[model samples]
Target: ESKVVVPAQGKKITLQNGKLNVPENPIIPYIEGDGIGVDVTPAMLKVVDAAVEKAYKGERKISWMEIYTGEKSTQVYGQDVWLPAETLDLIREYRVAIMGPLTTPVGGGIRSLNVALRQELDLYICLRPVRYYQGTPSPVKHPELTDMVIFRENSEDIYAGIEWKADSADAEKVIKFLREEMGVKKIRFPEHCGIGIKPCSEEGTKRLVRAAIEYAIANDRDSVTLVHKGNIMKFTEGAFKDWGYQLAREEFGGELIDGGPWLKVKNPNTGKEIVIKDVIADAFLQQILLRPAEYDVIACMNLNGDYISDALAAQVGGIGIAPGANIGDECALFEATHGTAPKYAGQDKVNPGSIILSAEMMLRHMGWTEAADLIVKGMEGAINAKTVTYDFERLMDGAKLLKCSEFGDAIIENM
Candidate 1:
C-alpha cells in the first residue's frame, strides 16, 4: 500500500548515449530531513531555484517533490515506521534524490536508516570532497592543502552491520563458534567481548578503487591514495589495498615505480600520468592534516572512509559545510553529511551550507554545469563577504551573522 505522491508532468532525467538527458524542467524528489532540516532544506530549495532561474533565464527548472522519511514520515506513513519501501521504490524509478539530516532512533535497526539506503540501492560509493573555502576558518596551518575527494566503499566492510550486541546470546554463539569450530584464540576473554565481523572482499574493494581511479582520470588529478590499516588486519583491510593495486596493474595498465606499491597510470583524458599509491590508515590521518596536498582522490573501505572524511573535514572546517553523495551506477542520493541537531530544530538557525552545496553537487551530477557553477560562485561570494551562519560566524572576525534563512538570501543576492 503506497501512499506517496510524486509531481506529475515534470521530466525525469534519463540516460541517453550513456549520458544524462536532463530536460528543461526536471522533477527532483527531496526529504527535508529532521531537526533544523525545516530551515535548511527550504533554504537549499530556494537558493537552487534562484540559481536555475538565473542560469537558464527561466528555461530550465527543478520541480521538487516532497518525499517522506524520518520524523516527517511518521506523520505521513503512520507511527514507528521511519523508512517506507514506497519512498525507496520511487527513488529507484526516478534514479536520483536528495535528503536532509535524519534523527536515527536510539539503538536497533533504526540507527541504520542511512546504511540501509545504501545497501538497498547498492549505492556503493560514499563520495565526500573535503576542500577549503577562501573565507572559512581552519585548524590546519595550510587549509588550502587539504582538498581531497574520498571514494568510500559504501556497501561492504564492517559497515555491512554484521554485528552482535555485547553480552547477548547471539554474541556468545558467534564467539563460541569461532573459537570452538574455527580454532581461533586471538579473541581475548571471548565471554566478555562483543563480537562484530568485518567483511572486505575483492569484488567490493576493486569496484570502489575503479571509481576512484576513474575519477582521477576524469578530473586529471595527481594521485589516487588507497587508505587502510592493511598493516594490522590482513584479510579485510589489508586485502583492500592489495586488490586496489592489482586492479590498477591489470585493468589500468599501471607501471611500478621506485620498488613498487607506488604505480603510475596514464590519465585516460589527458594522457598525463597519475600515481596510484597506498598509505597505512593511521599515518594517512596525520598526513591529511599535515600534508593533505600529497593526496587527491582517495579510495578506502567503509570504516577508514568514515574516519578520514570527517578528519579531513576538520582541517578546513567541520561537517556543518560538508556535503556528500551516495551513488551506484544507476542512481545517486545527495545528503548533508552532518547529523540533526535536535536542540536547534525549527530555529531558523543551523548552517544551511551543507545541503545547499549538496544541491550544487546534485546540479553538477545532472549535467547542469552552468547552474551548479552559479551555486558555487554564490557560496564563495557569501563566505568571502563574511555573511554566514553561526557555524562560521563564531570563528571569523567582522563576520556578519545571518540566520539560516538569511544565508540563503545572501547566496541569492550574491548570485
Candidate 2:
C-alpha cells in the first residue's frame, strides 16, 4: 500500500506484549535529515555498521533501509510532501528507527517536524542520556560526575500548543472569561495579552514516571528524581510531583523513607535500593553543577526537561554531540539532539557524534549490547586520542582535526 516506500528485504522488529522481538537482520529505517544531516548521517551509519560487524563477527546484521522525511521527502515523493504517510506506516511496522537532525518546513500548520513525528507516533518519552567522554572538551572541572539520563514528558504541559496569539480575538475572549467568569485578576494587560494553558494529567504523569522508574530498575540506577517547579506552579507542576510519588508507591511498592516525602523503592532486577525523590526546577539546575554525582535519572515536564538537557549538554560538551530518543511503549526513534546547520551541509566538517551516539542507543535498544559497547568504546577511544572533528578540535590544545567522515573512520579504527 505504500507507494514510495519500497519495503526492505528483511524482517520487521515487533513489540510483543510490551517487549521487543528483534530479528538478526531486522530492517531499520533511517531519516536522513536536511542540512548537516547530509554530512553526519552517513558518518553515523558507517560507524554503526563498523561496530556491528566487529562485534558480531557476521553472526548478526542490520538491514539499513532509507526512509523519507524533511525536505528530502519533498524531493522524493512530491511537493509539500514533507512527512509521507508511507514513512509513518513503515516506522510502525519496523518499530525502531534512528534519524539525523531535520529542518522545520517553512509556513503554517506544522510547528516542528520533530514534534509532529513524536505526536503522530505517540512517542511521549524524550530520552536524553548525558555523560562525559574522557578527553572531550568541557566547560566544567569534573565533567565525569555529570552523568544522568533525562526522561522528558513529550506530550502535554506548555508544549501542548494550547495558546492564543496576543491581541487576537481568541486571546481577548480567553482573557475576558478568565477575569469576569473565572475571577482571575492576575493579568497585567488583559486587553493585549496572550493566553497559554498548561494541562498535566495523572495518566500522562504516571506513564512517564513508570518509564523512568522502569529504566532505573533495569539499569540499576541509584535514584529517579522528579524535577519540577512545584513550589511556584502548584497545580500543574506540583500535581506532576505528587502523581509521580503516588505511582511509585502504588505501582513500584515504594515506601516513604524515614516517614518523609521521599520514597525508597527496591529494584526487582538489581536487588538494590532505587530512591524516588523530587527537587524544585531552579534548585535542580544549580545542584546539577554543584553536586552532579548525586543524581542519576531525571523525570521532568516538557519545558524543564528541554532546559535541563541543553544545560547539562553544555556542561560536558555542547548540543553538537548530544544524542536523544523519543520513545513509547511500542516504538523508539533515536535522533541527534542538535539541529541541522545549513552552513555546514555537505562540508563534511561538523561532528557526527550526536547521530552516531544515537545509533549506539538504537543498537542497545535492540538488545545488541556487544555492538553498543563497541560503539561506546570506539567513541571514547576516538575522543581520548585527540582525533576529533572541528567542534572539539578548536577547543582542545594539540588536537588533530579530522573531517566528519574521518572522525567516523577514527572511531572504527579505535574500536
Candidate 3:
C-alpha cells in the first residue's frame, strides 16, 4: 500500500517542440491491457527488462511505472473507471508509454479505448513497420520483399468516429442540411442514409507526410508512397495528395520527376536520390503484394493507412506479431496492433509477441538503439531456433511449441 496513485520519483521525460529527451532511466508508463493482456503484458515486461539489462549492464535502465486502464482499471480504481484521468495524467507527464491489446466492450460507445487515447493525446501518427523476419511464417510467396513502414494519419478522416444512425432524427437533420443548405443531391437514398464525414486537412496531411519523408531520409529508405483514394473523393482525399506533394517540394526540396506527379529528392544523409510517389488506394493494395520492393515507406490518410497496415502485416505474418506506435509532436504511446483475444484471457495459452515488439519500438524511440537492437536479435534468435508460441508453430512446419511465458523465456535466453 505504499503507492496509492502514480509515483513521482521515476524519471520525467520532456519533449521540447516535438523532440523527445530521453533520460538514462526515463520513467515509462504502461497499461497492462485487457483479456490476454494478463498473459502478454508480463511476458513483454520480462523480455524488456532482460534486454535493457543485457544492453547496458546497469549503466542504463528503464524505470517502468504501471498505469491503470481498460478492465484492470475498473478493478483497481473502481467500477466505471475504464479510463481514469490518473492514467492519462501520468502518461502525459511521462511523455512516452507502451501497452498491450485493449478490450473494447461491444457497442459501449467506446469504439476503442485505443482510439480514445490517440484522439485525446492527439497522437496524430500511427506508425507500423512491417518487415519479414527470416524464419517467420507468412502467406506471401516473397515475404522477404515486404519491407516497409506505414505512417497513418491518426487524427482525421474516416476514423473521426462520427456517424449518425441511418434512422435517427440526427441523420434526418444531417441529410436535410446536405440537401437544402449545401444544395447536394448525390445521396440516391437520402431518406434512408447514414452519413459520416471524412476530413483531410492541409496541416494534417503535410505533417504526416513530412514525418514519413524525414523517416525515409534518416533510415536510408528508397521511397515514400502517398496512398489515397483520390479518384472518387476528389476534394478530401485528392486534396490530401496534393498537400503532401507540395510539402515535400517546399520543405524537402523535392524535384518533379519527368516534370510531373512523381518526384525525387536527394537523401540528406546518403546524397542518393529518393523517389516520392503516389498511388490510388485500390492499385496500391495490389502493388504492395505484386511489387512490394518498389515501396519502402508509406504515408496515407486514416482509412487507407489502417487498411495498408494490417494488409502488410499479413504478408509478413499477422497482427499477432505486429508492433505499432502512435506518436505526436511531444508524446509517443506504443501498443500492440492486434485485438484482444478474450477466449485466451488468463489462460496463459496465447502469444505475447505483439506487446514485446511494441516495447522494442518504444526502446528505439527512446534512442536506446542498443537495447532495441538486442530485442530484435532475441526475437530473431528465438524464431529462427523454432521456439515460438502456438501461432507461429501452427504455421511454421517444424517450430517447437512453447507457452506464452516460455516464449518470453526463450527470447531472454537468446538475449
Candidate 4:
C-alpha cells in the first residue's frame, strides 16, 4: 500500500510519498478547466470521492493534486498565458491527468489548451465512448442502438496545427507551390478564406490504429473498423487505411489468427489473416444511423472523429452524457466531451453524469474496480428511478428533475 501526503506550508503545497495501510495511492494530477468547469468539476470530484468512500470504506482513496492551467492559471500567472511549462513538466512526470473544458479563443491568442496539451504530450489516441444512459433523452427513436467506442487519432489530420487565411502570405505561398510544383489546374479564393494543411503521416496513422486494435483485443470486442474518406482523399485518408492494415498485419496477426481461427486456414499470409477492415467515411455517416450495430470499435483521424463522435452523441443524445478519454501509451486523461455551456454555469441545473461517468472510466483505469462498480450502480439506479437532470427531464413525461449538485448527492446516497 502506498499513499500521497499533501502538506500545506503557508501558501505552498507539497506532495510527500508514503506507504498506505490499504490500496496503492497513485498520484493523480488534475486541471480545473475553464467556464462551466468551476461548476461541473466540483460535482465530479465529489462523486468520485463518494464512490471511493462507499466502495472501500476509507481503506483506499485517490491522491488528487491540482495542476494549474486555463483561466485559473491565467489569473495566477498572467492575463494571456494559460498553460505553464511547470504544469507540462508535472503531467510528464506523473503520467496521469484529468481535466475539465478549457476556453478556446476564436481568433488566435492561444490555439486551444486541450489541443496544446495533447500535442505537447504526444497523446495520439483520443478514446471517446458513446453509450446510452437508462433515462437519458435522445434525438433518435432507438438511442440504445448507438453504443459504440470511437478511437480518434488525436494529434494528426486537420488538427495538426497547419492552417493559413486566404489573404495571408502563407496561403499565397501554398497556392504558388500547388500551381508550380504540383501542377494544379484551377485555384479559387474569393474572400479572405482560411487554409488548413492536413499532414497524416504513416507513423501517425499506424500508431492510432494500433491502439484501437489493441483496445479491441483487450476489451474482447468483436472487431475494429477503420473509418476514412479514402476514396476522395487517397493520399491522406486512404493512406491511413493502408497504414492501419499494416499494423493489424504486422503487430496483431497472431492474436487475429487465434481469435478467428476459420479465417486463418483460408488466408496463408499472416497479413491477410488479420481482422482489419475499412469503411468509406461518407458511408460511415450513413451506417451510424442505418447500421450502428454493425460497428463495435472505430478508428479514424481527427476531423472525422470530431464529426463522428458529436454526430453519434447527438443521435444517442447530446454530449451532456458522453464520456471520453485522451490517451497515450503511458498517460491518459478522462473528460466530459460536452462544451462549457456558459449559460448553464453555476445554475447547478445541468447534468453531472458526463463527468461522473468519465471519473468511472478513470476509476477502472486505476484498477479501483469496486469504486467503479459502485459509481455505475449508483448511476443506473438513479436513472432507473427517473431522478435525472433537466436534459432528460425535458424528454420524458413527468420525469423528476434534480439539480447538478443534488444529482451527485443522489448518486452518493444510492451507493
Clashes of each: 0, 0, 0, 3
Q: Write the per-residue lDDT of candidate 3 for residues 155-212, one digit (tens) a residue.
A: 9998898899898999999999999999998899887788998888999898899899
In candidate 4, stretches whose alpha carbon ends up further than 4 angstroms from where it belongs are 1-23, 189-193, 254-275
Ranking by lDDT: 2, 1, 3, 4
Alpha-carbon lDDT of model 4: 0.76
Return the TM-score for candidate 2, rounded to 2 decimals: 0.97
Off by over 4 Å in 3: 1-9
Better of 1 and 4 by TM-score: 1
Q: What is the lDDT of candidate 3?
A: 0.88
How large an RMSD does model 3 have?
1.7
- Find the candidate with the highest lDDT and give its number: 2
Task: For model 4, give the RMSD to the true fold.
Answer: 5.6
lDDT of 1: 0.88
Q: lDDT tens digits, residues 367-400, model 4?
A: 6879989888888788878888888888888778
Model 3, position 87: C-alpha lDDT score: 74
TM-score of each: 0.97, 0.97, 0.97, 0.87
Model 2 weakest lDDT span, ten residues long: 1-10
